[PDB]
Each structure stands twice: as C-alpha cells, then as structure tokens.
Ligand binder design. Structure first.
Ligand SMILES: N[C@@H](CCC(=O)N[C@@H](CS[C@@H]1c2ccccc2-c2ccccc2[C@H]1O)C(=O)NCC(=O)O)C(=O)O
Ligand SMILES: N[C@@H](CCC(=O)N[C@@H](CS[C@@H]1c2ccccc2-c2ccccc2[C@H]1O)C(=O)NCC(=O)O)C(=O)O
Lengths: 217, 217
C-alpha cells in the first residue's frame, strides 16, 4: 500500500485521510511523534527526513511505490487525478484552483495564530476577522452542493477541513451561513465518510499539537 | 481584453506579467496604490475591492471576459491551460504540483522575514538556511532543462521569480549550483522573454515596497 507520513496530529492531513478513505485507497500511515516541550523534539523525523528519497523532503508525504510526493496540495492533486476528482470543466477547474489556494491562506492564518506565543492578546482581534472569512466561502458556494459545482471534487475535502476547523475554533462562526452548515452535513453524509469519521483510528482533532497556543494536546 | 489588478509592486505579479507576455496576452492593467508610512493606505483597492464581482476579493486579479480569477496560482494555472503550459504526463504534473507549492512556501518565508519588525536580527539566522533551500531546487532540477521536464511550463515562471529573488538577497546563494545559474540564464533567454525584459514596461524590482524591512522602495 502507499505510505502517508505525518506528525501525530490532524493537520494538513485531515483532507488527505478523508480523501483516501473516500476513494477506498489502500494505505498505511507513518506517524511521527514529536518530542515534548520544551524540546518539541523532531529527531524521529529529522533522522530520516533525507533518507526517504523525497524530492523536497517534508511532512506530510505520500509514497505510492516509486511515486514519492510532498506538498499537501500536491498529494491531493495526485490522488484527485488518480480517482478523477478534478474539475471537469474550465469553470470547475478555476473554482477548484481558487478554492485550493484560498483554503491554504485561511488555514495558514489560523495556524499562525494558534502558534503565536502572544495568543490571548490577538485571540480576540483575530476573531474579529472570521465572519468575513466565512462570508467569503458562503457567497462563493452560493447554492451549489459542492465547491466546484455539482460534482464533488478534491477541494471539497480542503473546504470541509477548513470550515470544520474554524467552527471548532469559533463555534458560532457558521450560524449566519446556513449554506455552509448544509455543506458540512452533505460532506459528512458521503457514505464512506460517516464510518471513517466514527472510527477509532479517526482523530477529528487536533490539527495542532503540543507547540500550540490553543490546543497544545 | 483581459485586465490585471495588482499593487504598484512586483511581488506575486512578476510571474504573471512574465507569462502574460510570453503567451502574447493582450491585457490592460489596473494598478492600485499602497498608502505610505505609516498609513499604508489602500482606499481605492478597498473602495472597490468589493465591486468587481470577484469570488475571493484579492490582489492580484485577472479578468478575462466572463472570467474572474483571484489567487496568483490559479491565475497562473488558468493562463497555463489556455496556452498549454501545464505538465503533459503524470510525471510532469507531479513535478509541477510540487514546485508550485514549494515556490510559494519559500516566497512566504522570505516575505515574512522582510516584513518582520525584528528583521535585522532574524536575517543572519535566515541566511543560514539558503544553501539548503537552494540545494533542493538544484537536485530536484538535476539535469533537466526545465523544472517539470523537457519543456517550459508555468512552474518555470514561478521558479525563476523566486530564484531570481533569493539571488538578489544572497548574491552568492547560487555559486554552488550551476544548473540553477543556467536555468536563470536560460529562462532569461527565451525570445519572448528577453524581448519583454528589454522593454520599457518591465519592472524587476522590488518584490516588496514600503513596509518591507528589506527592499522598502
Ligand atoms: N506547504 C507544505 C507545508 C508543510 C509543513 O510545513 N510541514 C510541517 C508540518 S505542518 C506544520 C506543523 C508542524 C508540527 C506540528 C503541527 C503542524 C501543523 C498542523 C496543522 C497545520 C499546519 C502545521 C504546521 O505548523 C513540518 O513539520 N515539516 C517537516 C519539516 O519541515 O522537516 C504542505 O502543504 O505540505
Ligand atoms: N494567496 C494570494 C495572496 C493575495 C494577497 O495576499 N494579496 C495582498 C497583497 S499581496 C501580499 C502583500 C501585502 C502587503 C505587503 C506585501 C505583500 C507581498 C509582497 C510580495 C509578495 C507577496 C505579498 C503578499 O504577502 C493584498 O493586498 N490583497 C488584497 C487585500 O488585502 O484585500 C495569492 O497568491 O493570490
């Protein structure tokens, strides 16, 4: 089977595991335990970082035989092509490309913060920006069932992850956007997702580990 | 024709203009002003940011008829598909997907620094990592003429921008990687490239303007 390499948290892998499962992909996971604090030791990673034959060594990685991939987005695209979950029209391709890029921006923004020693201080002015963040996705999706269109695609995976993460962070963040809650429910409804999601293996959380300001566990 | 919206800067637009030209695109520009120190005023942008009918309001943007694309990479990709500047084989795509993601990471890395209040201190430390970064590009590239393979692709535009920029920051950063040095010369060679670059409407510098801790002009 393929090997998926990542740290011991939800993270950037949330959408990959969700993808793999959805597609019934055959895979094994390769969990990297990060040392504790202070340390936060990454030796277990660092010790093989350059020994896996990775183009630009990183976490997460997917090894599918001779095929060695880094860059979560890359990993995603790779699995999308494999299972045909890319946009089928230019329109769709564009929507997915914007979305893919957009999720990362927002993901990064949150991440940045939860790892900001000075959290508490900014943790409020930050929450000031979420409704706009959310409204963006809201207007975009509009009435479509899926982010690219009528057909589910890989970016739904990313979209799902991101929305869930904000929600989780700011529980009300979605009350104003019913379309967005419908989506969450619709993705959660995909038959292979519900089981997986109720699985012992499955760790809804936490995108973030020990190093975290909000959720250091 | 097509319209391109950006900040008086080079930044994210650099790869875009380069591709726009390469492909002989016919387009107009809508340049916006970034208020100064302090201020760093973007009224205009802000006065209209919400009036363009764009999906995720942002700079830059490219309007091509019905087509309104935000996110620089999406922009890049839309132009790539249009002129067949994408990877053609599965292998070419992976390389492309990887490099693209990799370039942005690296760009952000440098931008974050340039935008850090504690830049002077951070700098030396940041310098220390260059070789490694550079190294991965060099090896990933190996002996290929282009990042994805035998033919120029959009990622070449990404890569050149970024390599050109690290090279200005750390003029020696490349001495140990001649494939890289060739790549730069070779990229600058492309007929339509030299052509545009020689032109009077070409802006190399800088990636960052005002705010910029490094390259504030
Ligand atoms: N652009 C890349 C980013 C990859 C990334 O930065 N990887 C970090 C982990 S994600 C990173 C993180 C680190 C530790 C713990 C948690 C996280 C995490 C979780 C969720 C979201 C993002 C993060 C980042 O801090 C890493 O540890 N790489 C190993 C290395 O560089 O040698 C991608 O999308 O794959
Ligand atoms: N992920 C998006 C990034 C878009 C974005 O961050 N754009 C910023 C300007 S570029 C941005 C930047 C901002 C300030 C100063 C410098 C920079 C910069 C300079 C060079 C390269 C990249 C940047 C970005 O950090 C912006 O002003 N958007 C309009 C808005 O805010 O509504 C993309 O790739 O398109």
């Amino acid at each position: 089977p393929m090997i998926l390499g990542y740290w011991n948290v939800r993270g950037l892998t949330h959408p990959i595991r969700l993808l793999l499962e959805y597609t019934d992909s055959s895979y094994e996971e390769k969990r990297y335990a990060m040392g504790d604090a202070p340390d936060y030791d990454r030796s277990q990673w660092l010790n093989e970082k350059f020994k896996l034959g990775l183009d630009f060594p990183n976490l997460p990685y997917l090894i599918d035989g001779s095929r060695k991939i880094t860059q979560s987005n890359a990993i995603m695209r790779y699995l999308a092509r494999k299972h045909h979950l890319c946009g089928e029209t230019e329109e769709e391709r564009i929507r997915a490309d914007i979305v893919e890029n957009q999720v990362m921006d927002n993901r990064m923004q949150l991440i940045m913060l939860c790892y900001n020693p000075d959290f508490e201080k900014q943790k409020p002015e930050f929450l000031k920006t979420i409704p706009e963040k959310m409204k963006l996705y809201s207007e975009f999706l509009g009435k479509r069932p899926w982010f690219a269109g009528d057909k589910v695609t890989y970016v739904d995976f990313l979209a799902y992850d991101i929305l869930d993460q904000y929600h989780i962070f700011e529980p009300k963040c979605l009350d104003a956007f019913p379309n967005l809650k419908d989506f969450l429910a619709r993705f959660e409804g995909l038959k292979k997702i519900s089981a997986y999601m109720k699985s012992s293996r499955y760790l809804s959380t936490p995108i973030f580990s020990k190093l975290a300001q909000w959720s250091n566990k």
